[PDB]
Amino acid sequence: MEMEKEFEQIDKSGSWAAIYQDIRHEASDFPSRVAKLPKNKNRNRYRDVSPFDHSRIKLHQEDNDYINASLIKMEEAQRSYILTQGPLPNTVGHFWEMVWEQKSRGVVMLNRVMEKGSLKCAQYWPQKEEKEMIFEDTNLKLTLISEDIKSYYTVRQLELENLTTQETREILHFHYTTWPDFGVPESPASFLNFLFKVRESGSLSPEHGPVVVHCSAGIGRSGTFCLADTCLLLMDKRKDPSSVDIKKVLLEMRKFRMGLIQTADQLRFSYLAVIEGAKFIM
Ligand SMILES: CCNC(=O)Oc1ccc(-c2csnn2)cc1
Structure with a gap:
């Protein structure tokens, strides 16, 4: 469904909060055991924002390899990001x-x-x-x-x-x-x-x-930046620019870092950015 029509339908129905909670419910849950070790407490800004073990960036040192940072690898778009x-x-x-x-x-x-x-x-x-x-x-x-x-x-x-x-x-x-x-x-x-x-x-x-x-925290504004960039690149690469599903791209990115897009307003804003971005090349 052409995201601009999807957009006007969510605005007129005032359902941004419902769409956003559905994303929260479907998002991946992977372990973050290294982030929670007592030795790493002063390396985390927020107790509830941690990198997954499978996608975390490792420092090249034997002492303590931990940093609060994630590799987001977008296979179809051929783009990678580190979010920290x-x-x-x-x-x-x-x-x-x-x-x-x-x-x-x-x-x-x-x-x-x-x-x-x-x-x-x-x-x-x-x-x-x-x-x-x-x-x-x-x-x-x-x-x-x-x-x-x-x-x-x-x-x-x-x-x-x-x-x-x-x-x-x-x-x-x-x-x-x-x-x-x-x-x-x-x-x-x-x-x-x-x-x-x-x-x-x-x-x-x-x-x-x-x-x-x-x-x-490296999830909210940071999530908006990578989500907008990847969606725009897919709309350039594919035959049908309307096949690009912003909710499906966001759930793919949430396989690599928890909590990307922190509010229904940031979601609405992310939709706004791609829609208005897709339009400026026309
Ligand atoms: C109000 C929008 N216009 C604006 O200020 O700047 C830009 C610049 C680039 C793109 C773009 C190229 S490919 N996808 N999006 C969109 C908008």
């Missing part, structure tokens, strides 16, 4: 170890460091060129190269150095700075514009490791 929590004071070094080890080109940040008067993630990148950051626990150096501030997003060029080998790489930081503290954006216009700058950059392409995507 906003880094904590004691996991900023782990975060950058993961970017290095997975060969990522891009980091996508969908939150502000402070929202609703509380800290949603650590200040994990340098704010000035001449004040670089050293992560002693993982042996990495991070330098700000340039910053481009726009009305709805900021792009940063960063240099990550593995101090063990003196190898360096360029990382691109895509920071969506205008998601409102409550609810979802009135239009998906700027969020859809933001996605195409990340793509534009090469950060989502198969010559690189998977993009790292985060918000505060």
Whole structure:
């Protein structure tokens, strides 16, 4: 069923809450035993948001390989994403170890460091060129190269150095700075514009490791970003763009990380984004 007609039918019937609970009921339940070990308590931001064992990213170290991060592998779309929590004071070094080890080109940040008067993630990148950051626990150096501030997003060029080998790489930081503290954006216009700058950059392409995507918990805004990107790519690839079922794509993604899309408004917004996205190429 053409999702735009499906959309108007759910709006006129006011049934977003019912559709969203049906997704919650059908979603996969896999173990997260490593996340719950007592040694990992200060590596989790939220007690109820954990990576599954089967899809978790492992750090390359014998001491403790754990990070709150998941590999979402979309077979038909030929896209992979790493979805992770906003880094904590004691996991900023782990975060950058993961970017290095997975060969990522891009980091996508969908939150502000402070929202609703509380800290949603650590200040994990340098704010000035001449004040670089050293992560002693993982042996990495991070330098700000340039910053481009726009009305709805900021792009940063960063240099990550593995101090063990003196190898360096360029990382691109895509920071969506205008998601409102409550609810979802009135239009998906700027969020859809933001996605195409990340793509534009090469950060989502198969010559690189998977993009790292985060918000505060790494399931709500982060889930909206990957769901919109995958649905748009499938509508390009297939003979019948109307065969793309957003609810079925979301349940496929929930095989790899729990809780993706946190509210009926984020669902409605995700539908809105693809519908309005499919339409702008016409
Ligand atoms: C209000 C919508 N228009 C807008 O602001 O920007 C864009 C940019 C790109 C796409 C796209 C290409 S392939 N799937 N979606 C959609 C919208």
